[model samples]
Target: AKQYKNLVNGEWKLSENEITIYAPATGEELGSVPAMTQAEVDAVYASAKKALSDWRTLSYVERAAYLHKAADILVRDAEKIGAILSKEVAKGHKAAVSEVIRTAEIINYAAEEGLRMEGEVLEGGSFEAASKKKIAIVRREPVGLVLAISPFNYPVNLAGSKIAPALIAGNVVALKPPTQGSISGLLLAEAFAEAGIPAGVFNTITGRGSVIGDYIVEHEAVNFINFTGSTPIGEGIGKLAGMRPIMLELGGKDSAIVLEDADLALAAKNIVAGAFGYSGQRSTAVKRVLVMDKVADQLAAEIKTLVEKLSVGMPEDDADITPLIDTSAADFVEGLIKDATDKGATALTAFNREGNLISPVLFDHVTTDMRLAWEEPFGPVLPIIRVTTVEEAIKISNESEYGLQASIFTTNFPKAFGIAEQLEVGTVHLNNKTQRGTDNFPFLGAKKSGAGVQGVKYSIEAMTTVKSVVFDIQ
Candidate 1:
């Protein structure tokens, strides 16, 4: 087995204490990563701070060239890296591979967008308080050393989502990869290193969040934080971060509303795809469906059939339902299933569980009281709630703690647009499913789902602050 080392100051460093990573599917020892301690973090902070000045001084073209190099490296080794991602998190191989490739595209696009991050040009006299003879120029500048934290679900892509923009915007980064998915993050760091990114400009620190997470978050050198994970964790980070700029992409109970005038067959397929893809581990995953009562049975039947056809097995099989990231995730999902079934929710598909590889579940008549209706399962489960009218559907959907995204199924564009506006979510997919990342759109959540916009262009904006150069007339 190859040793997976931490990327610190452009070199691979190892600690005596290590966290052994195991295969979620077979419990095989995959590899291990350094269980970095707070003492280790102290050095990482200093290293990142030391590198900040030099990195941030570079022109956009120079910085962007480095990003382009990393993008090329990621594409070149996506297969090898994606295989590790698949093993580390048990995501299907193809999807895992696709994540790495898409990540490259994100990096590539962010690099180009970095070059085009035009500054604002204005006459200082335009403002009532300013003189007519003065001129002012405003441009985006790096916030400072960014502390990037990525989730296990989309380790490579999400990690790149933060690291790419932060670096392209001329900020140094100290990335904290999810413990379960450290290999992918470290691999990405390697790409940057091979691309000749300045030393300490990008780094990866691996360990359990419970142990070194908060210490790193509160580190004096971390000028900004960009985290993607659960709501509780994001909230905790928010409290700890205080006045510092931070971006969080957290949990979601994203719902799909099937209106009375919807294309039932189309709605059913898209809903199932949105709900169960990658076992619903995504924050954008449609966790529940709110359908008109008139078509609820029909939609449920359609979804059930699709779920039944999905293969459930190991990642090697590229099964639609592979074992979850770990046992704890499985435990939580099982609990949700139990609560839903106990509360008179009927399972539309066979509710079978073999360790973490649970079959996709489609539950009908799932009322609001059921845990499945409101809680985020982050697994392969979809709850269908019946609503007699669009108003009833909207009311039920808005009641959720999460407002990441929603899908409104309808041929009625006027009605759908109104509902889209009324929905509390950040994005509404009309006649489609709630998928994530066109890579250039403002992907965000209004509530517990997240703060800050993400994409190639918007991400660059979020990571940088504005600086104005004012010229006073003589």
Candidate 2:
């Protein structure tokens, strides 16, 4: 088994108190990582801030050079890193490797885009209130040390999304990956270090959140925080962070609406792909289904067929359905199933389970009273809440405490656009599954789902604030 090491400043150090990591699929011990103490976390923050001055002064082009090299390293070592990621998190091997490759692409994109990022020139002369000769040259300034926390579902891609933008924008970063996925996170940090990025500019810390979670958030040196995780945890971070700026991609109950005019084939296929992808571990996963009652039975049958066809096994086997990240997550999914079925929803697929490996389940006739109808399962179970009208669908969709993203399925262009405008989510997909777009488009959430915007350019903007230099023509 491998014992992962944490990179603090320029050194890779091992800690005495270790947290053992296990493969959710086989219950095999994969490795151990340091469960860092408060003092150690504080020290990590101190070092990160110490690097801030030099890092912030680097030209965008200079910073981008290092990230490009780091991206190359990531692509070169994708297979090995992906293998570890699959074992630790139970994501399909192919998907895990793709994540590594995709992250490299994102890093490259951010680096190139960062060079093009620009500020504004404000002419005071144009405004009647000021002198004609007065002008201001505005530029973006790095926000000092950034504390980035990435979730288990996308330990590589999501972490890369945060780290790349922050670094390219000239902010030093300290990454705290989820405990379940720390090994993979360390590998990513190593790539940057190996790329010859200045020591302390990029670092990784491993530990149970309980031990160092709050301490890191409240650290005096931290200027900004970027986190992707559950809503409850995001809330906790907000309370601790006080006035610190934050970018949170939190919980999402993305609803997919299937109208009577929808193409059953397309709607069903995409719903399954969106709802159960990675066993529904993603914040962007489709958790609830809003279907018109007139076509409810047809849509339910189509979705049920797809759910039955899904293959369940270990991540190494490249199964469509695999074990979840751990036992507790599986239990949580089971509870949702129970709540739905107990409240009169019918399970359209056979229920099967073995440890963390749960078969995909689709619940029909799920009512608002059912917990699955509203709460986010974050697992493989998806519920269909039948509605009679588009307004009903929109109402149910907006009722969620989360407003992340939603999808509408209909051939009627007018209807699709109309529903889209009425929904409260950040992004609306028509005739497609709900998922985050690539590096360019903005990925965000409304209400309790998230705060701040995220994308390559958007992220760089968030990590930096504006500074204007004024010139008075004598």
Candidate 3:
């Protein structure tokens, strides 16, 4: 089995204690990582603080070059890393590979965007012109040390998404990946090291969240926090962040609203993909389906058939459905399905549980009172809620504490356009499911979904502070 260590001050050091990791697919020992102590965490942060001065001394172009090199390295080792991801995280082969590729793409995009960090200069102002000509220049500078905490779902892509932009914008980073699947993160750190990232500029620590995570979050050296995880944990982080800047991509119970004139075929297919893809662990995973009563039965039937057709097997097989993170996750999903079924919700398909794997469950006649309807399952469970009109659908989707992404499936362009504008989500898809986006596009959330936008340029903007300079001339 492989073993990993913490990266501090350009050196790989081992901890006295280690945390063993198991493969979610086969239940085999995947590897182990150092259970770093609080002092180790403090050292990592101090190193990052020292590195910041040197990192910012390099121009954006210099920073972009390192990111580009890291991207190239990722491309070269994509398959190997994908295989590791599949074994450790239980992500299917294709999805794992796609994530690796996407990580490289994001890094490349961030590198290119570093060149486009254009500043603006306001020509002579009128009010000030009465006395003298004044020019105001607005520019951006690095926000210094950044702490990035990534989730396990899309390990490589999410971590790369935060690290690339932060580094390209001349900021130092201390990355902490989910302990469940951290080997992929270590591999990424190796790529950065190989690409000649300066010592103390980028660091990776591994251990229990309570120990390492709490220490890092409360550290005085960290200037910003970029986190992607559960809402409850995010809320705690938000409270701890205080005056420091933070970018949080939290939980979601995303909704897919199917209108009366919707394309049932497309809706059923895309909704199934959105609900079960990555075992529905994504932040934008579809949890509730709000269909207009006029065509609810037909759409539910189609979706039921699709659910039945889904294959459940090992991750390497690229099964449509596979085991969740562990048996407890499966049990939690099973319990939620049972609660819904007991509360008048009808199961369109049989709920099967074997070992760590749970077959996709489709619940009909689901009411808002059931936890499944409003909560994020983070697993393959879809709760269909029937509604009467587009307005009702909008109301139901917006009533939740989350406003990540919402979908409206309708053939009427005017109605779709109007509904899109009214939806409280950060991004609304007219005909697509709730799960949609490119690495370069703005991805954000309203309400409790997320705190700020994240994209190549958008994240760079968040990781930087604007400085305004005014010049008085004769």
lDDT (Cα, tens digit) per residue for candidate 3, span 1-474: 778987888999889998898989797898898889899998999999998998898888888999999999998999999998888888999888888889999999998997578888877665565644787788878999999988888778899999999998889998898887788888888889899899999999899876776787988888999999889889999989989999999988889999888889999988998899988888887789999998999999999999999998899999988789877778888889989988989999888888878888899999999989887888889999999977888899999999998888889988788888988888887788776367677889988887989978889999988788988777
> Please, what are the lDDT tens digits per residue for candidate 2 over residues 341-365?
7888999996788887889999999
lDDT of 1 at 22: 88
Per-residue error (Å), model 2, residue 187: 0.7
Global lDDT of model 3: 0.88
Candidate 1 local lDDT, residue 391: 91
Residue pairs that clash (backbone atoms under 3 angstroms), model 1: none
Clashing residue pairs in candidate 3 (N, C-alpha, C atoms within 3 angstroms): none
Candidates in order have lDDT scores of 0.90, 0.90, 0.88
Tens digits of per-residue lDDT for model 1 on 1-474?
Answer: 567998898888998788888888888788889999888898888989999999898999999999999999999999999999999999999999999999999999999988888888788667766488777789888999999999999889999999989998999999899988998888888999999998899988998767797899998788899999999999999999978999999999888999878898999889888888999898997888999998888888988889889899999789999899888999999999999988889988877889888888889999999999999998898999999989998999999989999999989899889989999998998888897769898899988898998877888999999999988778
Q: Stretches of candidate 1 above 4 Å error?
A: none
Ranking by lDDT: 2, 1, 3
